[PDB]
Amino acid sequence: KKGILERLNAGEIVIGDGGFVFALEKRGYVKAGPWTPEAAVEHPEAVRQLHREFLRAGSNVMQTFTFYSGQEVNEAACDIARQVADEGDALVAGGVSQTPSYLSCKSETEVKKVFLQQLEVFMKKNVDFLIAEYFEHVEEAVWAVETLIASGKPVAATMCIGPEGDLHGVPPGECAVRLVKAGASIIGVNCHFDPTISLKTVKLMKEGLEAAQLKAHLMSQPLAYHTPDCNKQGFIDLPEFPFGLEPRVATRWDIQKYAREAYNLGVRYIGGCCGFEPYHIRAIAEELAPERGFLPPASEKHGSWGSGLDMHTKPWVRARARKEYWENLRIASGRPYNPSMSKPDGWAELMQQKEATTEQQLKELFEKQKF
Amino acid sequence: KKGILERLNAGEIVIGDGGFVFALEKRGYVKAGPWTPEAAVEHPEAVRQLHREFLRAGSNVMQTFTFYKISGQEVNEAACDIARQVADEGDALVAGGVSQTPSYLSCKSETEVKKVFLQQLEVFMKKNVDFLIAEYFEHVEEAVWAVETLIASGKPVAATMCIGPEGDLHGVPPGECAVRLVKAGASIIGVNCHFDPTISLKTVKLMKEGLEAAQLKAHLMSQPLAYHTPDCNKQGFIDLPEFPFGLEPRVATRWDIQKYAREAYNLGVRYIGGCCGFEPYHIRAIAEELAPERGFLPPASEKHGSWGSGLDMHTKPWVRARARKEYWENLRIASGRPYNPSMSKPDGWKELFEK
Amino acid sequence: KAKKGILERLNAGEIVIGDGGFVFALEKRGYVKAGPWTPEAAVEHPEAVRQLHREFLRAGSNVMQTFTFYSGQEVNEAACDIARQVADEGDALVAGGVSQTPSETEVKKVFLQQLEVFMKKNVDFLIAEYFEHVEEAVWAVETLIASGKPVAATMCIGPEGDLHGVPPGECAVRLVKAGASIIGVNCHFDPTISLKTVKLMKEGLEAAQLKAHLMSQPLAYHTPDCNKQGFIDLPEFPFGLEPRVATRWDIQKYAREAYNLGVRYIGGCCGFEPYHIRAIAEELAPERGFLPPASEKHGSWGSGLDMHTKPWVRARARKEYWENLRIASGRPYNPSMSKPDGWGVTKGTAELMQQKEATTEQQLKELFEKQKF
Amino acid sequence: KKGILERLNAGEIVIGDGGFVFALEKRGYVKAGPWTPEAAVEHPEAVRQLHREFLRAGSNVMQTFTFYSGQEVNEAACDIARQVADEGDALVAGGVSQTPKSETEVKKVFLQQLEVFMKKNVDFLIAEYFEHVEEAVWAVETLIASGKPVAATMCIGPEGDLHGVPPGECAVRLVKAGASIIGVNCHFDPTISLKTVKLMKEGLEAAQLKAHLMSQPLAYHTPDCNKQGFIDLPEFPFGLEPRVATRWDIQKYAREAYNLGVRYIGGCCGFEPYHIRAIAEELAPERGFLPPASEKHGSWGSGLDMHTKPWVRARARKEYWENLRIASGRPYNPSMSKPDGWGVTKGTAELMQQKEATTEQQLKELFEKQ
Ligand SMILES: N[C@@H](CCS)C(=O)O
Ligand SMILES: N[C@@H](CCS)C(=O)O
Ligand SMILES: N[C@@H](CCS)C(=O)O
Ligand SMILES: N[C@@H](CCS)C(=O)O
Ligand SMILES: [K+]
Ligand SMILES: [K+]
Ligand SMILES: [K+]
Ligand SMILES: [K+]
Ligand SMILES: [Zn+2]
Ligand SMILES: [Zn+2]
Ligand SMILES: [Zn+2]
Ligand SMILES: [Zn+2]
């Protein structure tokens, strides 16, 4: 069966898997805060079933449920991803992410050592390809890519940045160029922002590559959460993260729109990150079913654009069984006492004194009737 | 292991499981429209793991994933076996469920209806379920027929109706609905589906009062939707334009469900569960909210914290500051869809200026 | 020049259009102080009061309500004179109003003292408005009918009834029996809720086999989030009500609905500006036979826009567009509804809740820690 | 009585008046569509009284209710504006706006209006509501020949004029043409307006040119506008009610304008007399006095401190009103709207359509087969 580059170079669509840590937190197996993957040893059956759900939804990639006991967890996670990839038309991808910010670790040699430790496990397990994901600094992302290409395996690289660029101020087009130069054959974005914002960022990255005359496959794994209110830091800074994000979750129609837009933009590795559940992955695969020539196994429990409803007893329910209905319906929040957007949080008693001095001037103007 | 009545007669809280057909639809194993449970045979591994998630979240009841190239009998037998396997992995009972006869499948007389319930009861007796639930009834008449059939089993019967404060679809009010169910033999009554927790508990209150006026005692049960439905009319969420594929925004947070669980408890509800939309973290929220009353946490709480406490070691001070009940309890969360309304209306049925 | 009286118009089946909300409109213009809401402008700036009465006249109003309250008496005499002046410039009558007062003997002497000026000034009819207790409203009506002039009576209550718990039906019945020839509601609630209340009032009269004309002067503010106490208890009252203001289309909807319910004196209270009154008159123009003078600076359902350069603006020039457009708030960081304020719990009820909360907090912390162990 | 430049050169705040055509449309005197000011002859009492409300609210400028009958309307409007200006500490500004075609032909239209303004001896001239900086520069060139000060404001946002000229450049060109006051009016809410004025100011600093700054934004919230401004919003002009600023919103604007170095602080469509009062109240400590309309008001809700209900009294503070996220009262309606616009060509819509149609037909047969 085909490897990752053989698929992409043949013009195929590679469907990603969804958001493991977020989905498993909801199912009771991951702890928000650490977000660590010990479930791979503690409850492998849960991890295995979620891989299998994504595979059934049409995923071509099983990302390893791994992190930086210890290597026992990582090895176990690799073995589960392998078992499931082998049950269908999927590859295993070993990922690395930016190093933790609460660690002292920060030199090039030491940051690279961290990436090498993780790669060790992935080489021994013989993963199909490698992903450098979840990088806010392109500098650090370049080091990860430099380290991983050495393996002799294809390397994808995604950054968690939006249109404003990385956390130094490096614009996305430039970030993309830098990653391709370091040897990444697949580039794009993951996490932090919704699909709309994510694709704006990938457009900039592609435009960076088009000027500069470089070739690279394009990749997107956005949040399944609507984040029109995000600043450049992404969704963590929203007041609702992580336990109040429910209202923002994409419908399967939102994701069909994303998958079409992504495809139209030239993205051929089309996936999703936090908030993506199996039905969201199926949406990608259904939207692009005519281009691929087939539906995923999960579509046997679905219908095109609500067709499963076309014999409901209620006329107004049957009338929903059309693309035009679902594509255009402005769904309600069910929370009329709540706002539709939030201001991101971010970074004194002198201001309270100044306030108090001004309050008193106005009070006096009014009380002295100075009209 | 204590039976359902021994628990409830002792003043204990019985946490229900969540919404199987909605949860499995999202995971790829149930088709919206028929909503049938053939996964119990085709993908028992998916069904088993979802029962296990609810058990881990604190559920004391595994509802059989039942209904009605594969027969109803086959599915139902397989569903019972899976529910039992997982009930035996913790402090849980198996409930054999029947619901109203399906709306897409023929008009049935009282006799024809009762045969249908008898066919399902035969499996539940063969498998020795712990108790029986008649749920998803919109008409009290049919609900009563189910209860009359089920109580012949010798096992306890719970009965819940998918109705709101205005009553059943023939216009019978909830108080009277509750009275007729208890008279038919049900020892637990309440509501499930169609309405959010707030509306559901309004309905349960009217049921309680009807029982009090009738001098009748029965345990109270609530399995509401996890979806906010302040815009529903008496027909319930099916008539919302967003049913079933646009309901995402309305999904309750865990905090919303904690609030539900406390309200429920205060009203006198002691079988506290959930229906369509309830995922495992939602069940965890019931169990956490009522942990002081019960004396323990569910296993899933090991991958959680009280009211955001898991965030108390985050790098960013503003994320750390979210680690408190006061924060989450009061945070009015944003929809993320500013081009969209907050409520939807349910579906149903010149020349003077020239001068 | 001779002019049909209020009952002559109503008995003949005609639509009487009210004026809008004086205190609110004049507060926005700089002549009334929110808090007291008193009408000293009638002497301090009579030109402002005159011009607002004129605007309502031009919009279609058949009633100039006097801009009156409980110097003092000279303010009320001046207000009556201005209302008279303006009523005489068009097809309008002067209505002298009395409101609830901040002992039966002692309260009726407040109303009597008010009625004196209205009799001296020879108002066309009398209005008992803004009453939250039907008991006191009936006293006003009793005092007022003794003038021999027609008396309308409106309550600021919703579908749950008056502040002593008396339902709207019973309220209407009582008021007709005390001698009111016109009854209904004003203020506190939006047009939708207001018409629910009138419908109950109506049903109450029918059940009593009584007869009276029906009137409505609702808020121009949307209040889906009100409780029985009305808009004052909303967190936004009175300086944050902007978003809630009705469009002229909302008011046309209201006018048709009121007409269809049997309301024949159709006006408005706080928030109604002149273009809202124009909406009532434009909506019921087929029924009345004519348009008000202000329609000369308007068009039916956006027709004035049909000459815009941009095609999308021109497409707005019809009824189906404005009738179905779900207009945006422009405030995405804000909610769509607010919880009304009210009596809290007692201190100490609250301090007891806090102590329990703190106990429970520690019980939860210990439970999580012990499981963790 | 000090003229416009004497006030501004001395560092004083000049408070503008509000939005005449919109306010008078609501009162029954102006027709939406033509938006013409014939009320100046038909109902002078209505125009006069609105001028008087703005004066009472603190306005230091009465803008003439004028347009391009005709000269008679404009003569009457000038006389009414002067009458009211003479009743307080206010000046009369003669306005010219973009024409509804060659340079000298456009300049004839400006010259014809300037003739009335010179005959009436206005205090200063305003070229306002221009979408092309080229036309605005022509206005300014014609108007400066009067020998009176000229202000120039454009109805553009941060993305610049309709020929793509950005705001920094627009400003520099208006000041080079002889405008001593520049800024923006209309089309956008106050937040977006001040973003534009910030760019204008930066353009002047970089070109080393000096001018006084002026802002006359909408009183409507327009976070959903594109660069064409509010006319393209689906609600323009009969559904804009929900968006209207509170007096607190305008106090926030007045403070931000001031901190940016704006000293001619006014408003455009949607500004009513209480919005102007809000500018004057916010800036009252910097000016040393309150407008006369504040006699019928209080600081930040203090007029409520005597209400019968404790929760109403509790509203009588800045901390309350400044932080209250007021509700829309329309839960079945959205918070924003997509602007209307040209969209895509007829043939592209044709293409896009059949492409989408085809996809859906293929999907249908994939489902039927598997
Ligand atoms: N591949 C990871 C991304 C976390 S940002 C997951 O699926 O959880
Ligand atoms: N017990 C069923 C109720 C569906 S209304 C379920 O869990 O899906
Ligand atoms: N007639 C009065 C009612 C105030 S509630 C007014 O128009 O202001
Ligand atoms: N000065 C004009 C500007 C409208 S864009 C007015 O006040 O109406
Ligand atoms: K993924
Ligand atoms: K359940
Ligand atoms: K009125
Ligand atoms: K102005
Ligand atoms: Zn992620
Ligand atoms: Zn359900
Ligand atoms: Zn009122
Ligand atoms: Zn304007």
XYZ file of C-alpha atoms and ligand atoms in Angstrom, chain D residues 18-22 63 128-129 185-186 268-269, ligand 4:
20
model
C -25.014 65.513 15.404
C -26.729 63.874 12.452
C -29.391 66.074 10.887
C -30.765 64.092 7.974
C -31.180 60.927 10.067
C -23.470 72.885 10.459
C -17.404 66.419 4.232
C -18.678 63.051 3.056
C -17.175 61.386 9.104
C -19.979 58.828 8.605
C -22.668 62.004 12.096
C -25.752 59.932 11.252
N -23.951 67.007 7.996
C -24.795 65.916 7.519
C -23.879 64.625 7.302
C -24.725 63.424 6.869
S -23.626 62.165 6.036
C -25.995 65.648 8.562
O -25.869 66.213 9.682
O -26.952 64.960 8.182
